[PDB]
RNA sequence: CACACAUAA
C-alpha cells in the first residue's frame, strides 16, 4: 500500500490481495475508482520469433460506468473505446520488454469500481507498470502516467470528468526514470505550441513522482525477476561476420537516390538472399532466425549510419525536406466532396457524405452508449486496404491500427468542425497507395475534401511525421547525438527511432501520437521535434491552400435535402401505416428518412434532391 | 483511358492513377458511377494444393452506410448482395485462370462514386477483368460482362435502376473472346424460351465490344506477364504411368450401374490407394501431391471418355434420364407448410412459416434496415448442414455457397409468388442428404410446401442442373464433340464442366445460374441446354402435380391469425405500459406481436391460435 | 420404429428415413414435436490427443413459427438455451465412449416441428441416443432421459409447458443399462431433500423403458459398430514400468500437505520430465502421446490408490471437511453490493447492480442476437479471466463453461430473488483465482452481494462441489469401493469420477449440476453425495451469516432512483426531439433512461443521484 | 497449432 500525491490528486497502489495466481497484480485506486491489473508471462519461448504482447483493457459498463454491458460482451464484442485504451496502454509498456524477450505475455484490466468522476483508464497505465513492476517478468523501469488537461489557463493533473469537458486540452503522457518520455497522445483544441510544450514538462514532472511510489513499493515487497530460458539477440560473432558481407553493398543501395519503395525493398533482398546462404555455411549450427536476424540488425545499423554521418537521408533529401505533395479535389460527380492527397508515395482518397442528425444513434439504448455519440456529430472512418501495400489480407473489420488512426485523424479535424452543422458529417479516408504516414495524410485529405463539400471549416489542418535517429552509449546508454528527421518514409520509421505524428492548423496544434521505439527519449527532443513539424506544416498548408484555401460557398446542388411535410390527423394513420410499416418501407426503397416531429409535421430527410422527389410522390399518392 | 461504347450506354476505362501498389488497378466509369477493382498475386506458391482466389465486392456506404459498432459486427456486416455480387465477379474470372496457377490471388472492388442509376456490379465484373488484364498475372484473355434487360419488349444493355424496375428480365453475361460465354446468370419474370435465349445472344454481342476495347487498352498500356516459378500440373509421362496402371480397374467402376454415391466413391478410394503406392516406387523425386493429381487426371479422364464414346453414365442412365423423383406434402401437424422432395440421392425438407407483415421485413434499425427488405415479403433460406454428406462441419453463419443457392432458389419461385398476400411468406430449404443440385431441389420443394401451405401460387416451378462433358484438342482449343448429360450426379459435376441450374414453370424461365468451369462455351451450346433442360423440367412437374396439383383452399387451421381488439384511450396507458413495456414483455413471453394501427385500436397478430389464447388472457386481465 | 409409453406421455423413436448419408441418424417424436439427431464421426484418427466431440443444439425457430425477426430475417449468433442445451446432451452421452477414441465426432440436432407444449430439450437427448446406437460409432449401451417435475406434489414425467411453470423442480434425468446415472441436471424452488431425492430414483425408472424401446429398435434393425483404426490407451506394460520408476516420488508429492496448488504441480511436473525422459529410452517406438498418457494413467491411479487407502486427502483432509472460507462485503463504496467470498484458494469477486425494469427485455423483437426475458427481472454473469489460472487466452465471449457456470449459479440463487422488485438485478461473479468450484462460490458470493446491496432475499444460498473416488472390478466394471469427498480441488476434480456440484438454502435444495466422467454410477452414490454435501452446506452457511446473516433494512445512498417529470403539451415536441432523438440523446450522455408513461409524464431511471442531478438540469433547461 | 497482438504503417 502506496500513496502518491499528484497535487490534489491522491493516487492509492495496493498488491497482494485480488488474484494472486498471476505473475504480477496490482490495484490502482484514485477517489472511488478501482482498477486491477494483472500481467502473465509463458516461460515457455514462443515460436513467433517476436515479442507476443497483448493488452486486453476492459470495462463493465458504458457511459462513465453507468449503463452495465458487460453481460453483452459474447455478441456486442469489444467497444471502439476499449480498443483505443488497449492501444494506450501497449505503447506506454512495449518498449520497456528487453530485446529477446520472445515470450508469450497478456497484461488485463478489471473495472473493480468507477464512480463517474475519475478516469479509470490513466489508472489502467499505472497499473500495467504496478503489475508488471511487482512481478518476476523481465521489465525495465517503472512507468508513471498521468493526463494534463487546461482549464481557464490552469494546467491540471488527472482532471475529472467534468473538468475534461471544460479542457482546452487532453494530453496523456508516460514518462520512465530520469524524466524519460516513453508515450505522447493529445489531442488539443488549436492551443499555442507553447502552451502545449509546457504541459508535456509538468506532466512528465508528475510521472516522476509516480515512478518513485512505484519503486518504493517494489522495494517493500521484494521482487526477484526470473531467468528467462534464452534471450533471441543475435550473438555478435553473427553481427559481425554479416558486416563485413554485406556492409559495402547495402551502404550503396541505401545511397542510391533514384531508388523508390519497390525497388529498395527488392534491392535488399537481393543482397539478404545472397548474404543468407554464405552465413548458413559459415555457421551451420545457428539457428535459423539468428541468421534472418543477423542481417536486419546489420541493414539498419548501415541505414543509420549514412544518417549520422552524412545527413543525408535514403532517398537523398535532407533532415527537413518534405516529399512531393499534391493535393486534388472535386473527383467525382456525385460524392458530396472528395479529396485525393498524394504525399511521396503515399496515396489517399478522402469522401465526405452528408446524413441526418437521426443516425447519430443506433435506437438502442445500451447499443448506442457503447459506441457514444460524437459531440459535433462528426466522424472519421480510416480503412488500410491490402492493396495499398501490394499484399494479401482479409478485408472485413477493423484492425487495432485502422482504430487508432482513424481516431487521430478525427481528433485533428475536430477543432476545426462548426457547431449546429444541419447533417451528420462523415469522413472516409481510404489509404490507396501506402509508404509514409497515411494517417497524417488522411488530415490532409480530410481537411481538403471538408472545404471542397462546403464545411465552412475555421481553417484547414495538416499534419506530418518526424522520425528519429539516435546513436547511443552500448553501456551508459545515454543518447550522444541524434537527428530529427521531417515526413520520414516506411523504411526510415522500421528502422527509426520514433514515429511523431502531429498536426494542426497553422496557428495552433490539434492532434499528437508519439510512438517511441527507445525506452523513453529525453524531453528535449520531443521539443524540437514539435518544433521542426511546426515548420513541415507550414509548408504543407501552402500546397494544399494553392489547391482550395477556403470553403465553397455553398453545399453540392445535388446534395442531402431537410424537408418538411405536413399530414393530418385524419390521413396520419394511413400514412404511417400499422405500426410504422409504410414509413419505413418508403426508407428501404428510396433511402429517405422520415421522423415524427410533432402531431402534424414530419420531417423528410433524402440524400439527394431526387430522392426528395420520388418520396414526395409517395406522400402526394398515400394522402 | 478506352472508351467503349454499348448503344445508348458508354463505358469509360481507365488505369495508372489510383492504387499503384497493386499487380493490376482499373477503374470503370459508367455515367457517374465509378469502381475501382484491384488484383494482387504473391509470387510464393501457396501451402493449399489449389488456386485461392478471392473477390471481395464491398459497398463503401449504401446511403450512409457508416461502420459497424465493433469488430465482430464488422466480420458479419457484410450484406447479402454484396457476397451475391463477389460470387458473381468469382465466376467470370475463375475459368480464366491456368491450370496449376496454385498461388494466392485476391480481387478487390471499391466503390469510388455510385449515381443511383448505373448499376455498380457489371462495372466491378468488368473492372476485375481490366485489372487482371493489365496487372502481370497469368490470365488467359479479357472478358466482358454486361446486364440485359427487357423493357416493354426491347432489349435493353445495361438498363438502369429505373429501368430494371420494369423489366422482365436480369440476365448477366460475362463473355470470353471469340463468343465464348463464361458466366450466366438470370432472373426472368416467367419469360419464354425464345424470348430469353434471344436475349443471350445479344448479350454476348455487347461484351466482345467490351473485349475490343479492353485489348486496345492492353496493347497501348504494353502489358508484360510474369513468369510463375512452378505450373502445379502433373507431368506427362507420370500421367501415362497411371493410366496403364488403373485404365481397366477405373473402367470397371464406371461402368458398375449397381453403385451409389458411397459405394462408388469408396471402390474409386481402393483403387487411389493401391495405385499410389506403385507410383510412389516408380517415381521416388516426383512431388507428393504430382502423385495425388496424377491419379485425378486419369479418373477424370476414363470417366468422361465412357460417356463420349457409349453414350452411357455411371449410374446407367442415358443423357437426357431424369433420377427418382418423390414428393411428400403435409409431414408435421404444427408446420404452416411443409414438403419433402427427393432426387436421387439427394433429400431437401422444405418448410413454409408465415408472419406478420410489420414483422416481416422491417427491423428496428432503419439505418441497417436498408438491404434487408423484400418486394413480396417472401424470403428463401437454405442451409447445408455437415451431415448432408457425412462430414463434420461448423453450422455458425451461412457462408457463401449457402447465401447464393438460397438467392437462386428464391429468384426460381419469387416470380410465382402471389401480391398483396396477409402474411410474410419465408420458405426454409434443408439438405439432407446431398449428391447432386440440392439447390434446384429446393425449388421444386419450396413450391410444393408453398402449394401445401395454402399460399395461392400461380403455378408450380421446378429445376433442374445440366452438366457437359467435352473433348477438345490441346493443340487447337476447339470443342469438336460433346454430350449434354440431365440431372447430373454429384461425380458429373465433379468431373464436367459445367452446372447449368436453370428453373422455371412449364411455360417458361425464371431463374438461371450458369457455372462454367472450361474457359468459355459456344453460345449452340447453352442453346441446347436451356432445350434439353426444358423437357427435363416438364417431367419433373409431372410428378410433382401428382403429390399436390393446386394450391390448398386454405390455410392450416392452427396457422396465423390476426385481429384488432379495441382498447379506450383511458385504458391506453395502462395497456401499453411505460415506454411501451406491457407489449415488449408480451412479445417476448409469448409469440404474439401487438402494433398498433389507430388511436383506439391495436392489430394482435398471433403465430398460432393457442398462443392467441395465452395472448388474449393477458389482454383481457390488462381490460379489468 | 419403437414407441415407448411414459405413463401419459409417448415417445415415437424411427429411423431410416431422412439424412441417410449421416452414420447414425433418428427421429423422436412426442406430441406434435420431432426432432432429428444425426451423429457423424470420422474414421482418420484425430491430431489432437484427446477425443473431440462437438454437440450442437440449434432452436430453428421456423418450427414455431417465430425465427424471421431481425434484418438479416434469419438467426444470428446460438442463444443461451441453445448453448446450455447442447452441453445437457454432450454430458450425457460423452462418458460412454470408449477410453482412448481419439476420433473426431459431432452431433447435430434439427428441431423439425415444436407444438408449443412438449419440449423438445428432452427429445433431443434421446434422440443423440438413438441416433449413436443405431450407427457405427463404437458406443456403449443406450441412454434414456425424461425430466420429473413436480405439480401439486404429484411427480410428472416429461412435463408439457403449461405444466413446467406450475412445477416446484425442473430436473433432468439420463441413466444408463442397469440403473446408472450420467447426467443430472436440476433447479427446484428450494424443495426438501426427500422430495428431491423421491424424484430421482422415479426419473431413473423412466429411462430404463426408454433404453428398452431403443434396445429393441436396435436389435430390428441390424447395427454392426465399427472396428477403429487404433484405441489410443497407454500399452500395459508401458503403464506398469513407468509404475516402477514413479511409484515412490509420486506418493511423497500427494503425502506432503505443505504443498498448495502451484506448488504440488510443480512438484508433479518435475517427475513427469524425468520419468518421461527415461521412458523414451526404454521404448524408443513408443508413441510420444503414449509416454505422456502413461505418467497420466501412474499419476492418477497413485492420486486415488491414497485416498482409498488412507481416508485422507493430498491436502491432509479428511473426507467430510471443507477447506478455509472467508468472506467479505461492502468492497467498493460505489458499487451498488459487493463481496468477496475465498473457498481455499479460489477467490470469486461477487458485484450487483441495478438497472432499470426496462433494460431487461432484450429479446429477438429488438435485438439481433439477444434472445428471451428472465421471467424474475434477475440475471447472473459468470466470467473467467486467463489470470485465475496464471493462464494466456483469448477474453472474448463464444465460451461455453462461463455460460454453463453462469447459468448453474444464476438459477442456484433464483428461488430467494424477492418478486417485483423495482429494478433488474445483474449480479456479475469473476473468478480471481481458481482451485476448486469457482460456480459454486459463484452463489455463496452471490447472496452475500444481493444481501449487502439491500435485496430482500428469502434466505441465503451456499454452494458445494462433491467428488469421488471409486475401485471398479478390473473386468465387471462394477464398484466395489468409494469414497465421497466434500470440497474438492482442482486436482481432485480432474482425477476423480464426478463433479456434484448442488446448492441450496439450509432447509432445501436450489441447484443441482452433476458432471460424472464415468459410464454410470449407482443411484446409492448419488443418494449420499447430496446428503453429504448438506452437512457441508450448514457448515458454509454457518461462516457466510457471521459476514452479513440478513440483508441491509435499504439500498446504498449511491444507488438508483426513480421519479417521474412532467412536461407540458405544449413543450411535448421540444422535449422529446424530431423522432425521439433529444431522449435518446440524453439518455446516451447521461446514462438515464426516459420513458413516457402518460401523455404528460415521464418516468425517469438514474443509476446514481448524481446522475439524476446531470438529468434534471438538462430536462430544466429544456423547459426554460 | 490457429486466433487475437505487434509488425517497411
Redesign the pocket.
Same mark, same amino acid.
Given at each position: 500500500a502506496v500513496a502518491v500525491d499528484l497535487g490534489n490528486r491522491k493516487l492509492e497502489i495496493s498488491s497482494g490481495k485480488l488474484a494472486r495466481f498471476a505473475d504480477g497484480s496490482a490495484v490502482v485506486q484514485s477517489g472511488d475508482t478501482a482498477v486491477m491489473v494483472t500481467a502473465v508471462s509463458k516461460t515457455k519461448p514462443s515460436?513467433?520469433q517476436?515479442?507476443?504482447?497483448?493488452?486486453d483493457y476492459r470495462q463493465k459498463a458504458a457511459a462513465a460506468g453507468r449503463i452495465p454491458t458487460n453481460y453483452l460482451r459474447r455478441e456486442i464484442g469489444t467497444s471502439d473505446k476499449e480498443?483505443l485504451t488497449?492501444?494506450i496502454i501497449?505503447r506506454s509498456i512495449?518498449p520497456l520488454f528487453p530485446a529477446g524477450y520472445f515470450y508469450?505475455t497478456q497484461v488485463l484490466c478489471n473495472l473493480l469500481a468507477v464512480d463517474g468522476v475519475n478516469e479509470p483508464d490513466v489508472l489502467a497505465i499505472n497499473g500495467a507498470s504496478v503489475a508488471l513492476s511487482l512481478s518476476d517478468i523481465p521489465w525495465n523501469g517503472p512507468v508513471g502516467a498521468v493526463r494534463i488537461g487546461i482549464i481557464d489557463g490552469e494546467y491540471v493533473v488527472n482532471p475529472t470528468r467534468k473538468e475534461m469537458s471544460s479542457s482546452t486540452l487532453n494530453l496523456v503522457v508516460a514518462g520512465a526514470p530520469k524524466s524519460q518520455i516513453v508515450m505522447l497522445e493529445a489531442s488539443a483544441e488549436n492551443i499555442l505550441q507553447q502552451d502545449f510544450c509546457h504541459a508535456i514538462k509538468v506532466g512528465v514532472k508528475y510521472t516522476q513522482q509516480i515512478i518513485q511510489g512505484i519503486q518504493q513499493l517494489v522495494k517493500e515487497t521484494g521482487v526477484t525477476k526470473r531467468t528467462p530460458q534464452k534471450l533471441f539477440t543475435p550473438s555478435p560473432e553473427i553481427v559481425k561476420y554479416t558486416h563485413k558481407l554485406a556492409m559495402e553493398r547495402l551502404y550503396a543501395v541505401f545511397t542510391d537516390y533514384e531508388h523508390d519503395?519497390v525497388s529498395r525493398?527488392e534491392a535488399?533482398n537481393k543482397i539478404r538472399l545472397d548474404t543468407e546462404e554464405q552465413l548458413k555455411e559459415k555457421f551451420p549450427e545457428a539457428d535459423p532466425y539468428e541468421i534472418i536476424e543477423s542481417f #536486419?540488425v546489420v541493414?539498419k545499423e548501415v541505414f543509420r549510419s549514412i544518417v549520422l554521418n552524412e545527413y543525408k537521408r535514403c532517398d537523398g533529401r535532407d533532415l527537413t525536406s518534405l516529399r512531393n505533395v499534391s493535393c486534388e479535389v472535386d473527383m467525382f460527380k456525385t460524392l458530396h466532396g472528395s479529396a485525393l492527397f498524394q504525399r511521396g508515395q503515399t496515396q489517399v482518397l478522402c469522401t465526405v457524405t452528408f446524413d441526418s442528425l437521426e443516425s447519430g444513434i443506433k435506437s438502442d439504448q445500451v447499443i448506442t452508449a457503447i459506441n457514444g455519440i460524437k459531440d459535433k456529430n462528426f466522424m472519421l472512418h480510416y480503412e488500410?486496404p491490402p492493396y495499398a501495400?501490394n499484399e494479401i489480407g482479409?478485408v472485413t473489420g477493423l #484492425?487495432?491500427?485502422?482504430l487508432?488512426?482513424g481516431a487521430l485523424a478525427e481528433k485533428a479535424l475536430y477543432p476545426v468542425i462548426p457547431r449546429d452543422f444541419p447533417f451528420t458529417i462523415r469522413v472516409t479516408s481510404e489509404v490507396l497507395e501506402?509508404?509514409?504516414?497515411?494517417?497524417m495524410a488522411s488530415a490532409c485529405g480530410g481537411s481538403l475534401a471538408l472545404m471542397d463539400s462546403g464545411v465552412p471549416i475555421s481553417s484547414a489542418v495538416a499534419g506530418v511525421?518526424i522520425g528519429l535517429v539516435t546513436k547511443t552509449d552500448p553501456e551508459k546508454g545515454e543518447i550522444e547525438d541524434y537527428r530529427l528527421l521531417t515526413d520520414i518514409l516506411?523504411?526510415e520509421?522500421?528502422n527509426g527511432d520514433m514515429?511523431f505524428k502531429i498536426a494542426g492548423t497553422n496557428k495552433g496544434i490539434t492532434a499528437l501520437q508519439a510512438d517511441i521505439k527507445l525506452p523513453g527519449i529525453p524531453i528535449k527532443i520531443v521539443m524540437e521535434a514539435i518544433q521542426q513539424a511546426s515548420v513541415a506544416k507550414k509548408e504543407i498548408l501552402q500546397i494544399m491552400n494553392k489547391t482550395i484555401s477556403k470553403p465553397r460557398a455553398s453545399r453540392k446542388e445535388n446534395g442531402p435535402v431537410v424537408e418538411t411535410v405536413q399530414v393530418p390527423l385524419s390521413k396520419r394513420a394511413k400514412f404511417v401505416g400499422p405500426g410504422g410499416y409504410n414509413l419505413k418501407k418508403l426508407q428501404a426503397e428510396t433511402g429517405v428518412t422520415i421522423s415524427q416531429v410533432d402531431e402534424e409535421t414530419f420531417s423528410v430527410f433524402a440524400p439527394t434532391p431526387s430522392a426528395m422527389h420520388e418520396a414526395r410522390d409517395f406522400i402526394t399518392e398515400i394522402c
Open positions: 515460436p513467433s517476436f515479442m507476443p504482447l497483448v493488452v480498443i488497449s492501444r501497449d512495449r508469450d519503395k525493398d535488399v #536486419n541493414a488500410f501495400t482479409k #484492425n487495432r491500427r485502422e487508432g488512426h501506402s509508404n509514409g504516414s497515411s494517417s511525421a516506411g523504411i520509421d522500421y514515429d
